[PDB]
Amino acid sequence: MREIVHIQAGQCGNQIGAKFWEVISDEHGIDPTGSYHGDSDLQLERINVYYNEATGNKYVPRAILVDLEPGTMDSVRSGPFGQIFRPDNFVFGQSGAGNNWAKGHYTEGAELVDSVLDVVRKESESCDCLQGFQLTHSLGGGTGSGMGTLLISKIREEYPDRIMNTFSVMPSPKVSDTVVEPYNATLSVHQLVENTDETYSIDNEALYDICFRTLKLTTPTYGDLNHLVSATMSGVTTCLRFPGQLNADLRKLAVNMVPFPRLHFFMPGFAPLTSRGSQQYRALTVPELTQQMFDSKNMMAACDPRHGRYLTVATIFRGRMSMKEVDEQMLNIQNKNSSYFVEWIPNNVKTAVCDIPPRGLKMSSTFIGNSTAIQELFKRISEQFTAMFRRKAFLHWYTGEGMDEMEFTEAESNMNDLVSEYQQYQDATADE
Amino acid sequence: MREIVHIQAGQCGNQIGAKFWEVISDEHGIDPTGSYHGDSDLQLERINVYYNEATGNKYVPRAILVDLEPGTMDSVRSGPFGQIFRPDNFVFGQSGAGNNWAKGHYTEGAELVDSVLDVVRKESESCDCLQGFQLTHSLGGGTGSGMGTLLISKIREEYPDRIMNTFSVMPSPKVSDTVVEPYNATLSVHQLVENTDETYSIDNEALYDICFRTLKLTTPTYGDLNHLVSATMSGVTTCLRFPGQLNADLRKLAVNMVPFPRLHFFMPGFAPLTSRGSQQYRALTVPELTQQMFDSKNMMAACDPRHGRYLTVATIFRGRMSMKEVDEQMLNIQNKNSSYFVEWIPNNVKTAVCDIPPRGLKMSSTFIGNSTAIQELFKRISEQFTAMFRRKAFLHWYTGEGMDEMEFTEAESNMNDLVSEYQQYQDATADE
Amino acid sequence: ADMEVIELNKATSGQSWEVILKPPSFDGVPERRRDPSLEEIQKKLEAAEERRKYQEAELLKHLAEKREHEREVIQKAIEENNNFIKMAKEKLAQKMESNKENREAHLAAMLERLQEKDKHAEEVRKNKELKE
Amino acid sequence: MRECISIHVGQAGVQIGNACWELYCLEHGIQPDGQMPSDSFNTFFSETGAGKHVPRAVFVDLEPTVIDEVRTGTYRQLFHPEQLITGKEDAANNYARGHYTIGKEIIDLVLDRIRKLADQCTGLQGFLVFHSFGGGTGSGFTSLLMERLSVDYGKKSKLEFSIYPAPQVSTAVVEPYNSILTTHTTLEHSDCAFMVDNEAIYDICRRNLDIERPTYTNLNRLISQIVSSITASLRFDGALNVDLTEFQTNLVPYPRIHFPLATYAPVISAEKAYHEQLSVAEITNACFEPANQMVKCDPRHGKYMACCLLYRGDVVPKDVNAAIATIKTKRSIQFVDWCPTGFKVGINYQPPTVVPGGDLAKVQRAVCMLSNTTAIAEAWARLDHKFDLMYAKRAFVHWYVGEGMEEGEFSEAREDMAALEKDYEEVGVDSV
Amino acid sequence: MRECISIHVGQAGVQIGNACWELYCLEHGIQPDGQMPSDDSFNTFFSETGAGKHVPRAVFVDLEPTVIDEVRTGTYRQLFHPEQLITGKEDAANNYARGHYTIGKEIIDLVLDRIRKLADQCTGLQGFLVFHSFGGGTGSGFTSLLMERLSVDYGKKSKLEFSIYPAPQVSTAVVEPYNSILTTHTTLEHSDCAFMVDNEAIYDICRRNLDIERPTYTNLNRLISQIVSSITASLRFDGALNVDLTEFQTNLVPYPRIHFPLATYAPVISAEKAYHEQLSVAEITNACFEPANQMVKCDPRHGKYMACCLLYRGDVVPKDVNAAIATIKTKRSIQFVDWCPTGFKVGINYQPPTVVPGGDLAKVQRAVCMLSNTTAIAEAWARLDHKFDLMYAKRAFVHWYVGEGMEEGEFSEAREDMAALEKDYEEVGVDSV
Numbered sequence A, B: 001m002r003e004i005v006h007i008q009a010g011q012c013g014n015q016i017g018a019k020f021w022e023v024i025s026d027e028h029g030i031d032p033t034g035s036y037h038g039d040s041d042l043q044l045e046r047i048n049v050y051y052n053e054a055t056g057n058k059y060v061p062r063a064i065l066v067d068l069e070p071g072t073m074d075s076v077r078s079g080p081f082g083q084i085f086r087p088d089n090f091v092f093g094q095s096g097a098g099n100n101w102a103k104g105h106y107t108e109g110a111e112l113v114d115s116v117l118d119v120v121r122k123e124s125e126s127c128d129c130l131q132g133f134q135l136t137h138s139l140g141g142g143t144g145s146g147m148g149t150l151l152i153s154k155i156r157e158e159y160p161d162r163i164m165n166t167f168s169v170m171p172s173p174k175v176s177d178t179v180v181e182p183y184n185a186t187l188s189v190h191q192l193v194e195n196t197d198e199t200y201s202i203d204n205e206a207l208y209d210i211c212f213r214t215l216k217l218t219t220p221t222y223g224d225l226n227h228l229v230s231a232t233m234s235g236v237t238t239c240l241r242f243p244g245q246l247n248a249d250l251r252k253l254a255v256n257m258v259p260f261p262r263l264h265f266f267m268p269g270f271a272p273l274t275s276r277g278s279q280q281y282r283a284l285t286v287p288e289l290t291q292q293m294f295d296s297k298n299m300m301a302a303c304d305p306r307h308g309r310y311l312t313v314a315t316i317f318r319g320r321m322s323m324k325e326v327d328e329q330m331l332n333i334q335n336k337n338s339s340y341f342v343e344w345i346p347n348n349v350k351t352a353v354c355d356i357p358p359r360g361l362k363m364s365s366t367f368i369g370n371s372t373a374i375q376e377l378f379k380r381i382s383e384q385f386t387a388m389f390r391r392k393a394f395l396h397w398y399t400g401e402g403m404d405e406m407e408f409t410e411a412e413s414n415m416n417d418l419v420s421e422y423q424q425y426q427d428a429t430a431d432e
Numbered sequence C: 001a002d003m004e005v006i007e008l009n010k011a012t013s014g015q016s017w018e019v020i021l022k023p024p025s026f027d028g029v030p031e032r033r034r035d036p037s038l039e040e041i042q043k044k045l046e047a048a049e050e051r052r053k054y055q056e057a058e059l060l061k062h063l064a065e066k067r068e069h070e071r072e073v074i075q076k077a078i079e080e081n082n083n084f085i086k087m088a089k090e091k092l093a094q095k096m097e098s099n100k101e102n103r104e105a106h107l108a109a110m111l112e113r114l115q116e117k118d119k120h121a122e123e124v125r126k127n128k129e130l131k132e
Numbered sequence D: 001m002r003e004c005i006s007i008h009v010g011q012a013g014v015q016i017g018n019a020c021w022e023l024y025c026l027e028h029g030i031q032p033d034g035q036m037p038s039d040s041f042n043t044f045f046s047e048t049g050a051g052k053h054v055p056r057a058v059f060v061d062l063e064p065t066v067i068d069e070v071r072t073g074t075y076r077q078l079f080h081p082e083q084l085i086t087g088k089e090d091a092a093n094n095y096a097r098g099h100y101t102i103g104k105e106i107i108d109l110v111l112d113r114i115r116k117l118a119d120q121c122t123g124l125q126g127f128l129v130f131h132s133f134g135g136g137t138g139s140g141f142t143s144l145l146m147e148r149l150s151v152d153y154g155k156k157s158k159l160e161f162s163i164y165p166a167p168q169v170s171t172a173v174v175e176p177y178n179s180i181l182t183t184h185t186t187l188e189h190s191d192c193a194f195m196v197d198n199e200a201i202y203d204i205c206r207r208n209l210d211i212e213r214p215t216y217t218n219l220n221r222l223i224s225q226i227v228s229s230i231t232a233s234l235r236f237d238g239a240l241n242v243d244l245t246e247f248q249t250n251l252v253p254y255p256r257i258h259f260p261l262a263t264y265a266p267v268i269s270a271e272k273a274y275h276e277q278l279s280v281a282e283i284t285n286a287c288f289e290p291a292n293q294m295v296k297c298d299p300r301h302g303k304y305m306a307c308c309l310l311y312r313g314d315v316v317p318k319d320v321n322a323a324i325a326t327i328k329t330k331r332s333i334q335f336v337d338w339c340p341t342g343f344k345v346g347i348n349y350q351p352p353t354v355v356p357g358g359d360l361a362k363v364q365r366a367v368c369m370l371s372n373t374t375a376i377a378e379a380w381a382r383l384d385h386k387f388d389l390m391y392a393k394r395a396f397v398h399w400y401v402g403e404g405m406e407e408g409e410f411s412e413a414r415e416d417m418a419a420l421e422k423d424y425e426e427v428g429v430d431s432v
Numbered sequence E: 001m002r003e004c005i006s007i008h009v010g011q012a013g014v015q016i017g018n019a020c021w022e023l024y025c026l027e028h029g030i031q032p033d034g035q036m037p038s039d040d041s042f043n044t045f046f047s048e049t050g051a052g053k054h055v056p057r058a059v060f061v062d063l064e065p066t067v068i069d070e071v072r073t074g075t076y077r078q079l080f081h082p083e084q085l086i087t088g089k090e091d092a093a094n095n096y097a098r099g100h101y102t103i104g105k106e107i108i109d110l111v112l113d114r115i116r117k118l119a120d121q122c123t124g125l126q127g128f129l130v131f132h133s134f135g136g137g138t139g140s141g142f143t144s145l146l147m148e149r150l151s152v153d154y155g156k157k158s159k160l161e162f163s164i165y166p167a168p169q170v171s172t173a174v175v176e177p178y179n180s181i182l183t184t185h186t187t188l189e190h191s192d193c194a195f196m197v198d199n200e201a202i203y204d205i206c207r208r209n210l211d212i213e214r215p216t217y218t219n220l221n222r223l224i225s226q227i228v229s230s231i232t233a234s235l236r237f238d239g240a241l242n243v244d245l246t247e248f249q250t251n252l253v254p255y256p257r258i259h260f261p262l263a264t265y266a267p268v269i270s271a272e273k274a275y276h277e278q279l280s281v282a283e284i285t286n287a288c289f290e291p292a293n294q295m296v297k298c299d300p301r302h303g304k305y306m307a308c309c310l311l312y313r314g315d316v317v318p319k320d321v322n323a324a325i326a327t328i329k330t331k332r333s334i335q336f337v338d339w340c341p342t343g344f345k346v347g348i349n350y351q352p353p354t355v356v357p358g359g360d361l362a363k364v365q366r367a368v369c370m371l372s373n374t375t376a377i378a379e380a381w382a383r384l385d386h387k388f389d390l391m392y393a394k395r396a397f398v399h400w401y402v403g404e405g406m407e408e409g410e411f412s413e414a415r416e417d418m419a420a421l422e423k424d425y426e427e428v429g430v431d432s433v
């Protein structure tokens, strides 16, 4: 595993993914033309991981922008950086999913599916090495949840020996776009649990709650929620972009993070939490940002870390800080909190220290955790699903698109199976 | 019975044979070119026993230098006496035994065995009347203990009517830290008891015990101890090597020394004991000369002479004095201690007087005894063997080479059989 | 007492005489064979050679069969290695193939689960596509 | 004559290999290409037609950048191209990946280059394999390389240099899985195995070398010193500088019991301590002090089956002999009943050579200890517990099974360790 | 005519041969080539050649060459006829079975077809004079084989031997008593008479008479030669007593088994201790009965006598000899057996006592030799048998003999002969039927 092809899906996915490319570029030092402008030599550290070596001094990003609506396909190019992406990979859709999973995964998706699954074998075949493919998609709408999972299933069928990484920005009723969201999510979670090697669970409720309460924005905008969302993506992809030698590969991450196939949903945690395009900051030192892994107020997935047990943890430290103290204080959050870390997986918490920090943040901490507490997120979605499904409400939007009632029953069943699996290893003890 | 063929085996055997040759050539009067330089004409008519009549005013020694390692084959020729030996008599292999008997007697030995069996063929065919064969080999290592006994067995099969003489410089834990030594020795002692007509037991514990106390040196190497063995060798090498008629033949010695076939291991005794550096000069008297070679402190085999009984004794005197007081002391040391001489073998102690004598110091005496006390030496080796063997330690080094577990059990059994045989005649009385 | 002289003989280069001091005290009666024969001496020597040349020949019996035993033990040293190296390749080639037909079987089992989805995405438009 | 092939496999194998070749060349005075104008070192480094010193080593890693770092770095072109073998994608810290998956593609190619260096040897002894325990290649590929070499080379020697996993230094959660899996498949193969615990060495370059955060450069600089001490005896010839294969015999009494314990003294940093010199007696008792050893365990609570003491430079026998007497008297070092013997001593002429741009200080005398102790089982016991902890719930097992591995292969591997622990437990017992 | 063939076997036989023949050259005047300066009886030991030289009628045999090569390189090389000296390659290594059964077997036929040719030059050969050691391999192995073959090849021809009894004081092997007993048992019936010479007895009359502390075989044999060249008195030169070798069995040997006389010689003179008075009879006649001047360690003060032969060399008149006998007969510890009388067959030879010019023994005007068959000789066999029984009890060195093809029973049979012979010498001392 050596080079990653990025895919953007739907309104959310295309916006979060663009804002990711917007923040990832200024870290490495790439201008909106494609060319490099960075200070040192340690930024273009085998850039062939996210950026494709273009016809000259240029470095075009290896991203495939996909959406069933032209609305998001005439927005980011007029905005910041957007001009950078290759023209051909902009796979447009004139029709639309209309926040319906069945339309996105079956009807409208089928026409554009084979079209997008020809623009990547003209990107991955041009890759002298290949890690896999990472997808930025929402689980609430129609294009991200529907079509996104369809590409996931199609490329897994075509490329079985690669890692399927995902940025699953799942729905919340606190920031909902549609009533049908629990149907869309459950149907895609069922697809995710079976077809992805690893997934970053980006809970909209968590983003909203850190915006509304911690950041204290009376009316949180998508941009505000996406700002923290991108800041989390930079922090996570850090290893996959710099010479850290600590699960810096897509496979090495999975083998260090997933102990059981179905339990591959990661609860991301970022610190410090910053207000979009502002913050002068007071700056948090090594001890001040270590313990913020147990504080749920720093979780990007609305699940209390102390409610469950950490199966595997990947801690990333961005910025200049003595690594000697960084591990020392990272050690104290174990010997004083041993209850929340599974005894049966020795040295399960792994630390990484880099030189490249995020946007305005001089020093940051990013906790990729595989906590059994994520069951709370799926419980919420299942509870939201069983509410409408007990009423067998809005089902005619899906059944009319060709779908079956049983197709929902398995998607639901397989999800409550996953919750019980997460509870299974939470209640599990190393005997003695 | 007028010609002999010398064979050198392994590091020890070659680093002793060359030292025996550099002392005996100097004893007669032959320079390192091959030519003669000696004073008189009396020591001349006896060189034909150990030296070959060469193509001119020179004499080449009848020696076959054998070793599986080239280390000892590029050492003595660069030193003092080495180029004197015939070039085609330097039959040496490249891949050594590695202090393993099974490797030397079976594996690495087999390839070079038939090769040396052709060198000994040529030298003995060029012999008018061959006496026998004498081998200088150690019992601790692999080449001497292993290959040496293999030549012994092969020669005995090819030349059944010749005497097999040996200088068996057997191992001690006081001088060498190699662990397998008791295995190497026991396995070769079993070969020696069956395939040699006569053997000089050179106990390295005895010459190690000849260190400082009243021996002059705290820090030895090997050469300093090799000084004593070459002096003991040159001490024996004055019977069938000089005009004197005593045991002036290899067979005549055996018929006068071995009363029972298996009891052919001789405890050599040399006096006066001199250090390699310091000199006694104008000292040592005839009654004091007789007194030394009958006590433990002068024995070349670490066995108390008063702990057993002398079956047969061969006393050699290198000193131009009157043979009256030389034998007057002989028939007075035994009347005082008649207990340590078997009554059943009349006049068992035989004296020899030669008219040279040495060059270093006018007084010299060598004793060849067949004492039942030698059982103590074999007991020690058997005790050292049964320590490692009782649990089967290091046996894989031998079993892996093709050897069997039973092969050790017979070698051990046959040796404890020899100790009981030596005790048998020790407890034997001329009563009934 | 008398010293009686008999006077033996007389010659040019020496003479001799017998002397009897005292008379002899006594006078009385005591006062298969076929020895030696060549055929018996050459018989006892032939028989001596018959056992001497036997003992040395019988010595070669214990030496020649022991030598061809060292030949079988060194032969065993290689044939035990050859029957180990055969077993080493026998296990490896079987285990390497075992892992081949193990992972190539799950790959087909994988592309069955995510192949039956295409059958479901064929039954959907069959359940859909309605102009009525 | 007596050549030795050094095979370096994985990130640890390559990096510890390049760190010691840096010292090996400094032990003679070789330049970064092969320049050393006006021996015994030709055993580890061959000679070309041009008149330069070509290496008789081979570096293999399924990932390129590690080997690329040496083919572009400081010690460049002292080697030819053929022997620095590389693949594209790594074994992603998975045994099955390095053994069955990626390793299979490179196995025949390494076992094609393997003889086109072995054929350039007049008579090679065997191999020196350098590998990690927790790495994908260091475990997977080494095991396959060892298995296949036993068919390709047969009974030939294999002396491995295993790197025991430490939690503090950068690792993977699956390291004990890879550790147990590799040893089980390398017990019947590999004649000797020198283990080096990263924790034990991390401790001394932090407690004796005062470096709070030591990098692999500092880590390997210490490893190199012990490997250079273990070797040397075959790379040089002193007065009585004992060969490793000769005392391999003294160390390995049973085929499975081939794990010696490495210890080194003195361990002093370049800063301060110009004074005091360091006495001959102090370093000898430091060998028994559990602080200065390469593997974490207590030899105080365990039985000694062997004890090989290796010395460097400024050392005299009388001071060494007295230093051994002080450990026999003042200390209660429980030696096993079946061997006495005791210690196998070996003094080397070469002074302790240090890296000029390194951290360690130049000393007059250095000592290395080999000793086969029952206490090594305590290191296996740590590994087996961690394995049984993860295996109980089958954590990360799916990653191995996915690469074609059988679930029973794990239980069989643990059964070998369960038998080997019993084997080390049995050898202490003592007979009636 | 008469004649005498001298067969020398082993190292002792040969070295004692080149001692007798030297004192057989200076008596006559025969110079090292064979030429004579010139009674009528010297031809019994020397044969006239075509060229003119006098070749001695003898044969030297040893399984080892260097000992006979010593004579072949010596001044008397041209004396003995070039092919006369027979040699083998390897010795009998002080083993009876080696010299008798194995290495001797290869040379046996060659020696008796050689004696054959020197015996054909005799016009009525008397018999043989065999010279051998008791302790060597050859001499006590080959001699025995040679003797049993001379009895088949020559029949009823009288052959006498000169055995060299082993002494611990000179050279010696541990197995000497084994070789001693084995040879006598097999050579007893094939020998008409046997003169034993104890090396100890002659070694204990050189320091105390010739004044030589550590003597060599040259000094030892120089004395032996004098007694052998006193035993051959009338054989070498026309006398009256012992004129033929059959005239040794008649006067001495009373029974086939009892054939061991005791040799004695006087005077024992050196050339160092100034110049003393020429002491004749009644001074040297009593010296014959003094056990000091004897060749065998025996005490005839207890052993019952059989016969005597007082042999003289020099100018001695019968009148003073019978006057010397009268002085010795008066009160002495000597007694004869009942049946055999006190009859000494005294003989005198006019010839002067001849000595080696480059030797140590001095020229005397008169010399005396005494042949006496005494019971006391058994305590020289008793010495040997005890040493044999001591070693054979535990079978020490027996494997060396058995190895050369010998039977273990051959030892017990040999001891049984000595056990019978000891009884034979013992039973003689009884009165009388």
Ligand SMILES: CC[C@]1(O)C[C@@H]2CN(CCc3c([nH]c4ccccc34)[C@@](C(=O)OC)(c3cc4c(cc3OC)N(C)[C@H]3[C@@](O)(C(=O)OC)[C@H](OC(C)=O)[C@]5(CC)C=CCN6CC[C@]43[C@@H]65)C2)C1
Residues within 6 Å of the ligand: B173, B174, B175, B176, B177, B218, B219, B220, B221, B222, D240, D317, D318, D320, D321, D324, D325, D328, D342, D343, D344, D345, D346, D347
């Ligand atoms: C190669 C033969 C030799 O003559 C014998 C020793 C080795 N060499 C070189 C000198 C030497 C010695 N030791 C060395 C260590 C390293 C480098 C060189 C040496 C040597 C010596 O000091 O010369 C004065 C020596 C060695 C030993 C030695 C004495 C000695 O001085 C002569 N000991 C007798 C043995 C020894 O094994 C033993 O059995 O004594 C109890 C002993 O074991 C102990 C202490 O228990 C000891 C040291 C005393 C320790 C460990 C094992 N070795 C093996 C042999 C033994 C020693 C002498 C020369």
Ligand SMILES: Nc1nc2c(ncn2[C@@H]2O[C@H](COP(=O)(O)OP(=O)(O)OP(=O)(O)O)[C@@H](O)[C@H]2O)c(=O)[nH]1
Residues within 6 Å of the ligand: D009, D010, D011, D012, D013, D015, D016, D061, D062, D063, D090, D091, D092, D093, D094, D098, D132, D133, D134, D135, D136, D137, D138, D139, D163, D164, D165, D166, D169, D170, D171, D172, D198, D216, D219, D220, D223
């Ligand atoms: N002492 C030392 N330890 C190392 C070194 N490199 C890695 N390690 C350790 O060995 C283990 C990691 O194994 P690696 O060698 O890095 O992995 P690998 O052999 O390359 O196999 P793959 O990368 O999965 O293909 C951990 O204990 C590391 O801390 C090194 O250079 N020196």
Ligand SMILES: Nc1nc2c(ncn2[C@@H]2O[C@H](COP(=O)(O)OP(=O)(O)OP(=O)(O)O)[C@@H](O)[C@H]2O)c(=O)[nH]1
Residues within 6 Å of the ligand: E009, E010, E011, E012, E013, E015, E016, E062, E063, E064, E091, E092, E093, E094, E095, E099, E133, E134, E135, E136, E137, E138, E139, E140, E164, E165, E166, E167, E170, E171, E172, E173, E199, E217, E220, E221, E224
């Ligand atoms: N008087 C005398 N005794 C001798 C002489 N040579 C040897 N002896 C003694 O006779 C015995 C030795 O017998 P040897 O004649 O030397 O041996 P051999 O007859 O040659 O038989 P081998 O050498 O075994 O073949 C010992 O008692 C010797 O001391 C000699 O020349 N004169």
Ligand SMILES: Nc1nc2c(ncn2[C@@H]2O[C@H](COP(=O)(O)OP(=O)(O)O)[C@@H](O)[C@H]2O)c(=O)[nH]1
Residues within 6 Å of the ligand: A009, A010, A011, A012, A013, A015, A016, A097, A098, A099, A100, A137, A138, A139, A140, A141, A142, A143, A144, A145, A169, A170, A171, A172, A175, A176, A177, A178, A181, A204, A207, A222, A225, A226, A229
């Ligand atoms: N953080 C974030 N969440 C979004 C955004 N857009 C939509 N969502 C959430 O995801 C769901 C709508 O998915 P969306 O991608 O917009 O529709 P699609 O175009 O058919 O895939 C709802 O749950 C929204 O709350 C966005 O821009 N940012």
Ligand SMILES: Nc1nc2c(ncn2[C@@H]2O[C@H](COP(=O)(O)OP(=O)(O)O)[C@@H](O)[C@H]2O)c(=O)[nH]1
Residues within 6 Å of the ligand: B009, B010, B011, B012, B013, B015, B016, B097, B098, B099, B100, B138, B139, B140, B141, B142, B143, B144, B145, B169, B170, B171, B172, B175, B176, B181, B204, B222, B223, B225, B226, B229
């Ligand atoms: N006395 C003496 N003993 C030696 C010498 N060399 C080795 N040894 C001893 O003999 C044994 C080793 O035998 P060695 O000849 O070196 O091994 P080989 O070449 O395989 O026969 C050990 O017990 C050593 O102590 C030497 O030169 N002199």
Ligand SMILES: [Mg+2]
Residues within 6 Å of the ligand: D010, D011, D012, D063, D090, D135
């Ligand atoms: Mg690696």
Ligand SMILES: [Mg+2]
Residues within 6 Å of the ligand: E010, E011, E012, E064, E091, E136
């Ligand atoms: Mg002789």
